[PDB]
Design a protein around this ligand. Structure first.
Ligand code: MG
Ligand code: MG
Ligand code: MG
Ligand code: MG
Ligand code: MG
Ligand code: MG
Lengths: 88, 79, 132, 315, 195, 517, 85, 101, 49
DNA sequence: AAAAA
RNA sequence: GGACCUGGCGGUGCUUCAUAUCCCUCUAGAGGAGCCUGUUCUGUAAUCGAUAAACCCCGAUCAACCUCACCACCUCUUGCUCAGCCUAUAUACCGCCAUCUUCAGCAAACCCUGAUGAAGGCUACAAAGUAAGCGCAAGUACCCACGUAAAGACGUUAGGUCAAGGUGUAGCCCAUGAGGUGGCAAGAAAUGGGCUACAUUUUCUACCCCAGAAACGAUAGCCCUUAUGAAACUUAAGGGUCGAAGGUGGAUUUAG
């Protein structure tokens, strides 16, 4: 389409906790569990509003059920109405 | 994240500027200090709506106006 | 002697499948999970309600169909989707099967407030992998 | 059973055809590597076991090799050595014994008229699709070794090489760091290194004096302990390059000893660019050009610490 | 009672479109897929499961709906709802010199019918103060009134605003705060002489 | 609409209808069990709040009110209770959500209630007269409709088009040789509409055209005139009038098809491009046009129907199930009897494999088209589909499929025909039969197998009927050309015991085969 | 305390107690024995104790080319089927 | 049909604390205040003590929604320690795998 | 609100829409105990009987 | 201490 | 009573091994001091189970109030779920497990030898074992091919848990069930584990170890304050003066 992005991988975070195994005096035998949660974020650059909306629509229409989505858009803005030489 | 819950279509002046809801209170004193404190508390609260803030303000006003003997005996006047 | 959800071996007349003939220490190796959603990851809310809904759906599907489930249930939570991936034996009439499918779809869509579409997989007999 | 094999073969063929048709390619230029790549792409399996992967290669590789029937309709076995149980192994033994006798006869006639490893039991039973034991394997290996001692021609050479594999590479020589020039930079090279969570990067400079710059400042202010100074002087003393190099390093993360070891390893790896290979081999055989895998092992539950357990009372 | 029907494996052809068979992300139905793919851990002397009744092929999401030609057609059919990027905003320098105000957004996702997210209310306003009309006393007073919400290296004003459930209200509040900051910088009070 | 698993695929129209009815019954019982316990489906957890996730209420919400309580009891044993409450609390029943509800639920009771409301309350007269006419149109009443029309005309108000349409329908329903009466009624209606300053609607014109077509056999001119007048009013005409005109012209147009072509052109001009929703039977005209094109072997009308079916807007393509199946069968027969074999195969792949199974005439036509173009290989699946969709013509279909191979000789690569004949014979034997057995024996003898032919002959010889003359001669020749006249002797005995015509000749042939061979 | 109703086989195994330590040492007598019978056998899909006619389960669906109205059984037929059970 | 009483008492207390929340919030706000005379704080304490029990977030006991266990209950999925491992070994919690390091 | 789920399961078991094997086993055990000769007494009879 | 048209 | 087979045992014999095991031996700990938390006991109306290798900051990752399955006082009988018991039984179970077990056999179906007895079937320069599955290996993950983690059966302990959660038997359902207030959590004496110290290898000013100085530390007890709670009686911390006993522990033990 004409976006030109890159590829990178943030560090992963794995959570591990220790719980009991039985219901009575059985503390010397513990069973632990993990929580693998990787991270794969892109970097969309040089995109307008309609193109970004179309890309988000295409991403959401084929988004699997095993992953997530964190949209962080940074819009542009010239100058507000009161920033030049305003006196209240 | 704004489809449905739009805070009844309000702006920022109704959430930040809450001075237009304090009329039956003085200007310099501990009562005004407590009112400013509760106003600052309700201002930085993105969990409640402005209607609930006004309800709490009027309830506190009625509670302070009900027990007037203690405020009169506290060596100060209540407006 | 630590025994989990595995099947105890006795002689040679227990037709077990691939789900019942595996230990929980091989889930992320030679098995997998039945359901899949984003509630379990770190940093996300709404998980206890999802687990309660899942266990209630499993109990309902096991109680409504007497022995028609050859294995378990494979649920997929995709935003506002609840896809059921179950198997039904080839022992009854297809008309009753479609009737039950429609009834379950309507009940789930009207109870969980979510569009639900069922996808069945007809199996001629009980699923079996080994004679453990 | 053979009909099922043919059905699997034709199913694999039609699947390859349909895959080459849907991938926009050609059915003739769609090799097995492309098949494996398309299977791995279209089926994103999320498991750790390699045997639990979508495998759809050749049908004869997945399905076990069915042993053909050695007797026809009349009931007579095909091979002469069948009433035993181990037909292929004993046939090979008889053939190799006949070859040994022929070699002995040829050697007697000549006297009168005057890198790679062998096979294993697993490979043997996978090649001859016949289960055996260990004593027969040892007997066969000893017979082959006795055959290798005596003389043999090219025919016997290729005969004994047919049952011979090949060892892997054994060249463990070090790598010479290339001399990099960046805006007039003679005698310039970089390297890395890690020891017990400590990333360090050393920059070797030959046209200097005799000091090390650590994060801009010298190494005395950052390493007040004599142990770090000794660990930094050990490589310079082992190469006889004390007051001749003004190297610089940049380490981040870890304690004093960890960062010192990381800087030492980085400098040892960087000094392999302005010296011959004999000296770096001498360094490697003396404990220098090698990594330290002494990482703190995880703690075990139900104990006091890693290997220390609770006071287990007996009475 | 009992019957039998042939599957779609021997019923379809070869020169047939693929996205027309599996449009939406179907949970892989062993019927219209003529690919006898086997996945699972086999035994020492045996054959693992094929495609029918395979729990591994049912749990793992299949990616057969994203056909390359289908992806190309979908990307080409969406060209009508696109806007070309202007050539005057290609380099980052011109973008910073023209539009030096950046407004971030926080949009996450939740599993289930729940749409509200308590972490989707923060909108940090990043405005570079290297392009505004700031003199000496005004800039010093602005820095003093800000405190630690201003970077001394990149010179980017970072102010965290989150005092309402919505986002446009927080944006307007941040704009009003910046306006009051710019107004007070040009004013001198009675206690400013005793600095 | 159904599933995709192979075991639950719809093989015919009966399975599809059964699955659809089961789904509808499941939805109905689900809605019923939800309305029975409304206190178990109210705790919402969603956020956008779907409006289709709340059950409807049928109990009243007002007790001390009058008109509001009556409206809540009527709209939201209910109509009678609402009427009793309105009569007790003195509530004037309006013309909306009252008379129409009483006419739809309960038709002497609705007429009595309307008369009581008109005698006890005198509000709007035009709407009341229109409601009375609409209620009497379904109860056969001409005097009441005339009185309502007179009251609406004398009430100094604009007469509704619904009452006029109902009166015209009631007047032209039981018409006995009425030619100029319909024209006079149309002229009177046009004069009344011009005097009252109102234009005619499309529904009234469609109803008038249907009533005119449902009387005489050659009354397509009034329907065409009504359709033209409805189309010239400003909007598109209704498809019901065009369908009625086509049905009336197809009955009397047995010699010429000019009227049918004109009706098809009018239907295409009124509704051919965008499927505009403005009639009650939009697919009937398309089905009639497709049937006319299949009967007259037309290539333009069929193409127009295929283009206006589901190529742009699937609305007038299929109104139900039987009509859709008939249209598909007609299209398949036309494609098989018009072009060669490619178009027939395309139609069979896009209709017989996408909708449902075939019937009897369409299956016979497809078999004839396949036999005329050498395509005898997939006859077993067609026979199985015909037997599943119909247990009456299955034997006829099997006989027609086996006759294509029971008369030819033995070739080299003609095993598909023999396999199809064997499958048809097995399906006919395992169903619930002298001609079928004879045809199966002839096919087995003409195939090439000896054991199969002998088994077929032995099975057909016990059906109280021997084989034909050619089959007996072939069996005698095969027995004499094999050093075994046992088969010839058995055939002669079966022909002499079953009292057949071949007796002396069969005996002479058996004697010759026993003496020489 | 609600989500605890497991499968029927689990309840039968817990009630019969045939996988205990008393069956391998002769601790119990052969007379004391609890048999097992099939409970889910003569119950059609959609069999209730009130009497609701199901067109897609109980009564046939297509009745001579028509659809049967969803009705409800009375009390005499309910008593009849209870006596039959 | 339920069989336990402590779970029912706990859910009743949770409901009563959810209903009685604004008054308790106002009383707690009037409490922690260095300003304002002590008489108002005393009468607020008397009013909050005169209220009936079984209506306070202090009595909230984090139990399980399947077993109603008092102690040893996770606050994430709102369940005990045995049901968690049970449904993890069965295979309902995606991602929650046995720790193998 | 577990009471709503319990009532829903009960009304689905009563109408035959849910086959609860546990409650059926409980009812069978209660019937066997009542047939054995040890049933539940009436309302206001037992200790003073 | 024998086997739900 | 005579004879044969298996298991356990022999302070029963020969040979080879134990890599933290036995010392000749190395390091760190309990048993000697104080506190806290478990057993039992003391008067009381004040809970239950565990109570030898395989159990003790045990069920509990919380006994101030619900969390008290304990008691006393005031009441109720659709008594609150078309029911139920937090009454008694693991010597009725499912389910979650423990040392043996830091391993190498358990082992469906046949053949041979004990004249066809309980039983046994080993010898590769070979005198009767091939054999479905289970167990190790084979495998996943961390820094691989080391190592670690994770797995590790048939059975023993009528082993722990009917008080993870459901269920079997006896009794009640005008009660052992339920609604409100208070108390049982204080020490005559026996006891496991954890924490704090036993000097010049200690501590203070600052400093993350180039200085200067003092020939080591607080349990508990008194008062006040801070954050939360409806109430501070012990739970968290800090401030103010005072502050036990201890200049390295004997029979008896653990880990590396
Ligand atoms: Mg274990
Ligand atoms: Mg009690
Ligand atoms: Mg016991
Ligand atoms: Mg292990
Ligand atoms: Mg292993
Ligand atoms: Mg015990």
């Amino acid at each position: 389409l004409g976006i030109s992005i890159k590829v990178h991988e943030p560090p992963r975070k794995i959570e591990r906790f220790t719980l009991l195994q039985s219901v009575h005096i059985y503390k010397k035998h513990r069973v632990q569990y993990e929580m693998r949660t990787l991270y794969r974020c892109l970097e969309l650059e040089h995109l307008t509003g309609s193109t970004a909306d179309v890309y988000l629509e295409y991403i959401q229409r084929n988004l699997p059920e095993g992953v997530a989505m964190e949209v962080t858009k940074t819009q542009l803005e010239q100058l507000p109405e009161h920033i030049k030489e305003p006196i209240w | 994240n704004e489809a449905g819950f739009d805070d009844d279509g309000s702006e920022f002046h109704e959430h930040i500027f809450l001075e237009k809801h304090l009329e039956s209170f003085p200007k310099q004193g501990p009562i005004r200090h407590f009112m400013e404190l509760v106003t600052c508390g309700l201002s930085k609260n993105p969990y409640l709506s402005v209607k609930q803030k006004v309800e709490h303000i009027e309830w506190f006003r009625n509670y302070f106006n009900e027990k007037k003997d203690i405020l009169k005996e506290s060596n100060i006047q209540f407006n | 002697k630590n025994r989990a959800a595995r099947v105890r071996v006795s002689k040679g007349d227990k037709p077990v499948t691939y789900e019942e003939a595996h230990a929980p220490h091989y889930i992320a190796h030679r098995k997998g999970w039945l359901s899949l959603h984003t509630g379990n990851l770190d940093g996300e809310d709404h998980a206890a309600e999802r687990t309660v809904e899942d266990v209630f759906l499993r109990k309902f599907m096991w109680g409504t169909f007497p022995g028609c489930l050859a294995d378990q249930l494979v649920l997929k939570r995709r935003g506002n989707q609840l896809e059921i991936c179950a198997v039904v034996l080839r022992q009854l009439s297809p008309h009753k099967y479609y009737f039950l499918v429609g009834y379950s779809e309507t009940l789930l869509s009207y109870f969980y407030k979510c569009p639900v579409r069922l996808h069945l997989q007809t199996v001629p007999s009980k699923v079996v992998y080994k004679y453990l | 059973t053979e009909d099922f094999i043919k059905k699997q073969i034709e199913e694999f063929n039609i699947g390859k055809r349909h895959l080459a048709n849907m991938m926009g390619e050609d059915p003739e230029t769609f090799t097995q590597e492309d098949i494996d790549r398309a299977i791995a792409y279209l089926f994103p399996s999320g498991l750790f076991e390699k045997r639990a992967r979508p495998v759809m290669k050749h049908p004869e590789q997945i399905f076990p090799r069915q042993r053909a029937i050695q007797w026809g309709e009349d009931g007579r076995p095909f091979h002469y050595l069948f009433y035993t149980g181990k037909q292929s192994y004993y046939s090979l033994m008889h053939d190799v014994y006949g070859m040994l006798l022929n070699l002995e006869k040829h050697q007697s006639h000549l006297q009168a008229k005057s890198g790679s490893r062998w096979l294993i039991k697993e490979e043997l039973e996978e090649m001859l699709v016949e289960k055996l034991s260990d004593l027969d394997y040892m007997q066969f290996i000893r017979l082959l070794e006795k055959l290798l001692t005596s003389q043999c021609g090219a025919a016997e050479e290729e005969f004994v090489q047919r049952f011979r594999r090949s060892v892997t590479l054994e060249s463990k020589k070090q790598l010479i760091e290339p001399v990099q020039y960046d805006e007039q930079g003679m005698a310039f090279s970089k390297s890395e290194g890690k020891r017990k969570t400590a990333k360090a990067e050393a920059i070797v400079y030959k046209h200097g004096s005799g000091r090390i710059k650590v994060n801009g400042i010298d190494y005395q202010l950052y390493f007040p302990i004599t142990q770090d100074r000794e660990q930094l002087m050990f490589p310079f003393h082992f190469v006889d390059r004390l007051g001749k190099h003004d190297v610089t390093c940049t380490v981040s993360g870890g304690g004093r000893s960890a960062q010192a070891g990381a800087i030492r390893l980085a400098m040892a790896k960087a000094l392999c660019s302005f010296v011959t290979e004999d000296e770096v081999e001498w360094m490697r055989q003396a404990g220098l050009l090698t990594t330290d895998p002494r990482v703190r092992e995880r703690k075990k539950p139900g104990q006091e610490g890693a290997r220390r357990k609770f006071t287990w009372k007996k009475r | 009672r009992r019957k039998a029907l042939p599957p779609r494996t021997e019923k379809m052809a070869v020169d047939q479109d693929w996205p027309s068979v599996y449009p939406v992300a179907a949970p892989f139905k062993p019927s219209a897929v003529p690919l006898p793919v086997r996945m699972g851990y086999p035994v020492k002397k045996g054959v693992p499961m094929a495609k029918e009744g395979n729990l591994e092929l049912l749990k793992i999401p299949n990616f057969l709906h994203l056909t390359p030609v289908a992806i190309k057609k979908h990307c080409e059919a969406l060209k009508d709802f696109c806007t070309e990027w202007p050539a005057a905003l290609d380099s980052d320098e011109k973008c910073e010199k023209h539009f030096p105000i950046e407004i971030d957004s926080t949009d996450y996702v939740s599993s289930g019918p729940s749409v509200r997210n308590p972490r989707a209310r923060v909108v940090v306003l990043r405005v570079k103060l290297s392009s505004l009309n700031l003199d000496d006393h005004a800039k010093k007073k602005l820095i003093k009134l800000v405190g630690e919400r201003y970077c001394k290296t990149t010179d980017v004003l970072t102010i965290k605003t989150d005092r309402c459930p919505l986002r446009r209200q927080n944006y307007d509040y941040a704009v009003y705060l910046l306006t009051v900051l710019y107004h007070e910088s040009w004013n001198t009070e009675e206690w400013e002489k005793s600095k | 609409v159904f599933q995709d698993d192979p075991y639950l695929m719809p093989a015919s129209s009966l399975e599809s209808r059964s699955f659809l009815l089961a789904k509808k019954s499941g939805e109905n019982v689900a809605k019923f069990i939800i309305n029975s316990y409304p206190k178990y489906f109210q705790k919402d957890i969603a956020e956008p709040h779907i409006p289709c996730l709340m059950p409807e209420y049928f109990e009243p919400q007002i007790k001390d009110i009058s008109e509001a309580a009556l409206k809540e009891r009527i709209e939201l044993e209910p109509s009678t209770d609402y009427h009793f409450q309105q009569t007790g609390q003195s509530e004037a029943l309006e013309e909306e959500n009252d008379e129409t509800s009483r006419r739809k639920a309960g038709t002497w009771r609705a007429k009595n209630n309307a008369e009581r409301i008109f005698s006890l309350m005198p509000e709007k007269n035009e709407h009341s007269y229109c409601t009375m006419i609409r209620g009497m149109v379904k109860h056969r009443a001409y005097e009441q409709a005339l009185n309502l029309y007179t009251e609406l005309l004398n009430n100094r108000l604009h007469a509704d088009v619904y009452t006029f349409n109902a009166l015209i329908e009631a007047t032209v329903c039981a018409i006995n040789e009425k030619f100029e009466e319909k024209w006079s009624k149309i002229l009177e209606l046009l004069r009344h509409m011009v005097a009252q300053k109102v234009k005619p609607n499309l529904q009234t014109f469609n109803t008038i055209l249907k009533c005119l077509r449902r009387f005489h056999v050659f009354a397509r001119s009034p329907a065409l005139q009504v359709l033209r007048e409805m189309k010239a009013i400003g909007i598109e005409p209704s498809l019901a009038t065009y369908h009625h005109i086509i049905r009336l012209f197809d009955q009397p147009g047995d010699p010429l098809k000019r009227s049918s072509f004109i009706i098809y052109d009018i239907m295409n001009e009124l509704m051919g491009k965008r499927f505009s929703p403005k009639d009650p039977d939009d697919d009937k005209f398309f089905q009639s046009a497709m049937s006319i094109c299949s009967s007259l072997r037309d290539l333009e009308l069929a193409y127009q129907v295929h283009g206006l079916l589901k190529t742009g807007d699937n609305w007038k393509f299929i109104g139900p199930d039987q009509h859709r199946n008939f249209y598909y069968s007609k299209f398949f027969d036309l494609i098989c009897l018009m072009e060669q074999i490619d178009v027939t195969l395309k139609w069979y792949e896009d209709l017989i494999p996408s909708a449902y199974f075939p019937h009897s005439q369409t299956m016979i036509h497809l078999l004839q088209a396949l036999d005329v173009a050498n395509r005898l290989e997939v006859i077993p699946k067609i026979w199985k589909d015909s037997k599943e969709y119909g247990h009456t013509f299955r034997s006829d279909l099997r006989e027609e499929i086996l006759m294509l191979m029971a008369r030819d000789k033995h070739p080299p690569e003609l095993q598909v025909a023999f396999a199809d004949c064997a499958a048809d014979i097995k399906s006919a034997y395992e169903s619930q039969p002298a001609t079928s057995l004879n045809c199966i024996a002839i096919l087995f003898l003409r195939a090439g197998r000896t054991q199969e032919a002998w088994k077929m002959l032995g099975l057909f010889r016990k059906h109280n009927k021997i084989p034909r003359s050619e089959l007996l001669n072939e069996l005698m020749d095969s027995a004499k050309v094999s050093n075994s006249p046992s088969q010839a002797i058995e055939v002669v005995e079966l022909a002499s015991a079953f009292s057949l015509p071949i007796c002396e000749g069969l005996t002479q042939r058996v004697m010759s085969d026993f003496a020489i061979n | 305390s609600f989500f605890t109703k497991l499968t029927a086989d689990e309840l039968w195994k817990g009630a019969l107690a045939e996988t205990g330590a008393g069956a391998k040492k002769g601790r119990g007598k052969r007379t004391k024995k609890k048999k097992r019978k099939d409970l889910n056998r003569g119950q059609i899909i959609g069999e209730g104790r009130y009497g609701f006619l199901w067109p897609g389960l109980n009564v046939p669906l297509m009745k001579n080319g028509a659809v049967q109205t969803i009705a409800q059984r009375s009390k005499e037929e309910q008593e009849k089927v209870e006596a039959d059970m | 049909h339920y069989v336990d009483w402590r779970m029912w008492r706990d859910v009743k207390r949770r409901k009563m604390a959810y209903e009685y929340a604004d008054e308790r919030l106002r009383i707690n706000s009037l409490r922690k205040n260095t300003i304002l005379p002590k008489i108002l704080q005393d009468v607020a304490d008397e009013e909050i003590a005169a209220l009936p029990r079984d209506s306070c977030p202090v009595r909230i006991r984090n139990r399980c929604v399947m077993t109603s266990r008092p102690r040893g209950v996770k606050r994430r999925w709102r369940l005990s320690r045995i049901v968690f491992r049970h449904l993890a070994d069965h295979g309902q919690l995606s991602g929650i795998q046995r720790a193998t390091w | 609100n577990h009471h709503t789920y319990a009532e829903l399961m009960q009304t689905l078991r009563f109408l035959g829409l849910y086959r609860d094997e546990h409650q059926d086993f409980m009812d069978e055990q209660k019937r066997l105990k009542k047939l054995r000769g040890k049933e539940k007494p009436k309302k206001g009879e037992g200790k003073r009987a």
